[PDB]
Ligand binder design. Structure first.
Ligand SMILES: O=c1[nH]c(=O)c2nc[nH]c2[nH]1
Ligand SMILES: O=c1[nH]c(=O)c2nc[nH]c2[nH]1
Ligand SMILES: [Zn+2]
Ligand SMILES: [Zn+2]
Lengths: 444, 444
């Protein structure tokens, strides 16, 4: 029989509605993990007959609790979690030399890898991140452990062994071209041998500055021949953009550097995208490539602003990311709030005529990012057929950061309680986390 | 004898150093609430003789815990806490009509006042706000209760009965000029009769748009004759600035409207200040008037950016504020983080050549705001003679939002643990709160 039947309010997004609130509904989850039905509780009779369950098998949620889809982190450096909440005081390129490269260099030690990676998987899960797209480090074996660790905890993920054969400011932390290609192939081969249910390898050129043309082309080939996803960074910072102009002056723009070396495909996510032009956004659209909007990082490192309205105008797929540790928060709730705020910055400065609503950003954090990752057919909202990736919100949880009032339920501020959670909530309101139907939080 | 002797690390600001970290020190607090000494633990012998205490009376902090000064909220609407985390989706003036005025209008009921005000005092205290500068509502009696409630909990505060005799968009929520003046005098008189230790009345014209010249001049007179503090808002939003231009076209600028009606004195705090010119900032400096920088509000309502570097360049006193509910967070930790981020926005856009450091903003949140409120002689840092307004931080508290690593204490990221708390901490890391020497959190 069914693994779960839930009764209560369900808050999710569709392609035509940024936030649909489905009150007093019944959702059934199969033994395999799929949403098997979702209907008004009025159908409890017809559904108990169909699906052969007794009413005492229904779990009824508290009247002030709601389920929402698990949050989808489309860009996060697992290997930088050690110093997250720290060190956001140099712009990207100097930041990388001083903090990031020495940090990821520690991962040659596999026992150090185990500590940091165990903490970020658990930390991100307890904050409702059910799917993470991870940058690991250049070390295949330590990166393989990250995959093993996400499997062990039941997080859905892409794990990416980072490829870098150029590193002038910290030459200790790099590979040769040959080594980088051979180790990517070993990483992918050993990942696929594990046959994990929901952790996949992702082809991870660090970015143009770190990768020769040979490296980039070959990584594009591994992606194509093996039919794999690609992640990298693009156009985050102005000095980065100039530094690519001067390292790669034969290419019209940053997007072209990747495009012509076969690293801009329809399974490609690119972090940041702040200085992509309209023409570059057209090519993303044409290639089917996605952007991870990382607004905390973009403010914290003084990089810039992604104009998300324009990305949507161009019909480029887009999710939200945390980008730990350039963005200091591990929480996709922070990513949501920061995304709202950055859309407000562009309104204040008269770049756009409107800002983004909280519900639209909620949709980016869940359904949008599921699409940025090509996983929108299995996750991102509550559609029959989909995996049950879900977080249970109780805004009146023990020690809750939220104060609820009678007016939040009976006054004139529409979905006041959902808003209070999205703006003020933390992991204390996230009572239960589900991935693929199984309860992964609380931890055993 | 002494009420407390603490041993451990103390993190605070001075006028010459944004963040001074004082490791393994001894701080003594008198029975009256004052810091009576602060020295290296090497002086334990000499101090035990002087101050006549036995070593077993010293409380030794955990090796990973630190004391810092209580956070000073220089601008917060107590009466808007009911909908905080909600409704930040209209710019200031439409926001006021739709949410704020109907909300504050509820405070004619004194039992509704008691609920909301009890929650915000407690909530802000558990998040380390030891001093709040509160806007209440136009009702003197409900505002008197807020003063009573802050006294009961041991929060240091200014409580301000709001004055408004103009309100076109919501005429139900206003006073007559006569009523507003008489009720301010009753409010101040009944406050002073209570002889509270650390809750004071503050003269609170809502802002120019809400107050006639007669009202403003008379409130300036009550402030002068009674020697009281003044709070109001200034130049938050561009339509506000134009709306004052057209309501008050005989005055050179917004600052002049207040200045010429005696509401810009050396006990004056003005919220926001986003569109103050350099010349207006000169007058603030000359008058000794302060600004409450409310960056969450300024982003959330799409108002603008206060250029804090320029305010400091002009030597205008400045603290940070929460501005609940236009800014959605009740936490001065959020205020700090948002202030950092707004200084980054102005760097990204090339308005300034630098941004503000986290330590400078830490200094604004504690010492700066104590000065914005004219209370820098009694609070804001750990100087002998000062009140013991202090919060105990444990970053390894139960269910802590922070993951600490060996590298945070022994690596190359300077005060990595303090940073992690300032960026990622919440009320779970705030084990104990002290105001005037007495422990006010945990609550009895
Ligand atoms: O935010 C970022 N974090 C990184 O580690 C990195 N490497 C290249 N580009 C990057 N951007
Ligand atoms: O942020 C604000 N909140 C308010 O309630 C208000 N009233 C006038 N001006 C204001 N600004
Ligand atoms: Zn990144
Ligand atoms: Zn205000």
């Amino acid at each position: 029989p069914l693994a779960h039947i839930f009764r209560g309010t369900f808050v999710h997004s569709t392609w035509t509605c940024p936030m649909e609130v489905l009150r007093d509904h019944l959702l059934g989850v199969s033994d395999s993990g799929k949403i098997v039905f979702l209907e008004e509780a009025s159908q409890q009779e017809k559904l108990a007959k169909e699906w052969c369950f007794k009413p005492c098998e229904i779990r009824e949620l508290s009247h002030h609790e709601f389920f929402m889809p698990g949050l989808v982190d489309t860009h996060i450096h697992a290997s930088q979690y050690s110093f997250a909440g720290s060190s956001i005081d140099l712009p990207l390129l100097e930041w990388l030399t001083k903090y990031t490269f020495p940090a990821e260099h520690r991962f040659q030690n596999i026992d150090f890898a185990e500590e940091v990676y165990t903490r970020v998987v658990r930390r991100t899960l307890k904050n409702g991140t059910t799917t993470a797209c991870y940058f690991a480090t250049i070390h295949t074996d330590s990166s393989l452990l990250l995959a093993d660790i996400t499997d062990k905890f039941g997080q859905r993920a892409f794990v990416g062994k980072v490829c870098m054969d150029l590193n002038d400011t910290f030459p200790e932390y790099k590979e040769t071209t040959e080594e980088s290609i051979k180790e990517t192939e070993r990483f992918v081969s050993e990942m696929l041998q594990k046959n994990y249910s929901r952790v996949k390898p992702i082809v991870t050129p660090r970015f143009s500055l770190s990768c020769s043309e040979t490296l980039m082309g070959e990584l594009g080939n591994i992606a194509k021949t093996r039919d794999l996803h690609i992640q990298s960074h693009i156009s985050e910072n102005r000095d980065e953009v100039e530094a690519v102009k001067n390292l790669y002056p034969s290419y019209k723009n940053y997007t072209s550097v990747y495009d012509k070396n076969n690293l801009l495909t329809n399974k490609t996510v690119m972090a940041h995208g702040c200085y992509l032009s309209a023409e570059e956004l057209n090519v993303f659209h044409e290639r089917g490539a996605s952007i991870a909007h990382c607004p905390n990082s973009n403010l914290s490192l003084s990089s810039g602003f992604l104009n998300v309205l324009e990305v949507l105008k161009h019909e480029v797929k887009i999710g939200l990311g945390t980008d730990v540790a350039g963005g200091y928060s591990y929480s996709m709730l922070d990513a949501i709030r920061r995304a709202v705020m950055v859309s407000n910055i562009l309104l204040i400065n008269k770049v756009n005529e409107k800002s983004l609503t909280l519900k639209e950003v909620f949709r980016l954090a869940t359904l949008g990012g599921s699409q940025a990752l090509g996983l929108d057919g299995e996750i991102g909202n509550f559609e029959v057929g989909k995996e049950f990736d879900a977080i249970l919100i109780n805004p009146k949880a023990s020690d809750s950061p939220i104060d609820l009032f009678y007016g939040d339920f009976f006054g004139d501020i529409s979905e006041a309680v959902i808003q209070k959670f999205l703006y003020l909530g933390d992991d204390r309101n996230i009572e239960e986390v589900y991935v693929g139907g199984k309860q992964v939080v609380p931890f055993s």
